Amino acid sequence: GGNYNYLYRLFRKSNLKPFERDISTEIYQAGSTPCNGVEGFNCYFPLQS
Amino acid sequence: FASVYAWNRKRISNCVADYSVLYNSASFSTFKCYGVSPTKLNDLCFTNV
């Protein structure tokens, strides 16, 4: 199998209801104060291989 | 700060310290924590640190 063909989502603060699909492939940023006090930082891509 | 082979110790207790005021600080190269959500550090009590 491919080395990087499967990725797990390192995401939080959105505890999902049972049997919920989480396909919002978005770079997790906030653009507000609770991320280094600026926009564009702490923009961690949730998926990790 | 001393050398890596002679690093410095400190024991701390009987404190009421806010960690939220430190997490939002951007003066750090990296702040990543293991197994414990930093956002919840204000809702936990510990014997000592």
Q: Which of B24, B33, B42 should one mutate to test binding to chain A, selecting the residue with the greatest count of A CBs within 10 A?
A: B24
Please tell me whether residue B40 adopts helix, strand or coil conformation: helix
| H helix intervals, chain B | 20-23
CB nearest A37 (choices: B24, B37, B39): B24
Task: Note whether B47 and B13 are within 8 A (CB).
Answer: yes
Looking at residue B8, its amino acid is N
A37 and B37 in contact by Cβ < 8 A? no
Measured in whole angstroms, the distance separating CA B20 from the mean position of its chain's CA atoms is 11
- Tell me if B45 sits within 8 A of B13, measured CB to CB: no
Q: Are A7 and A47 in contact (CB under 8 A)?
A: yes
Q: How far apart are CA B41 and CA B19, in angstroms?
A: 7
Contacts of B4 (CB under 8 A, 6+ apart): none
Q: Among B26, B37, B39, whose Cβ lies nearest the Cβ of A37?
A: B26
**Rounded CA gap, B43 and B5, in Å?**
34
Residues with Cβ within 8 Å of residue A8, at least 6 apart in sequence: A47, A48
DSSP A44: B
What resolution, expressed in A, was reported for this entry? 3.6
* Method used to determine the 3D structure: cryo-EM
Rounded CA-CA distance B21/B27 in Å is: 12
- Give the burial class of A9: count Cβ atoms within 10 A of its Cβ; 0-12 exposed, 13-18 middle, 19 or more buried: middle
Residue in this structure with the two tokens 């770079």, named with its chain if needed: A27
The distance of B24 to chain A (nearest Cα, Å) reads 6
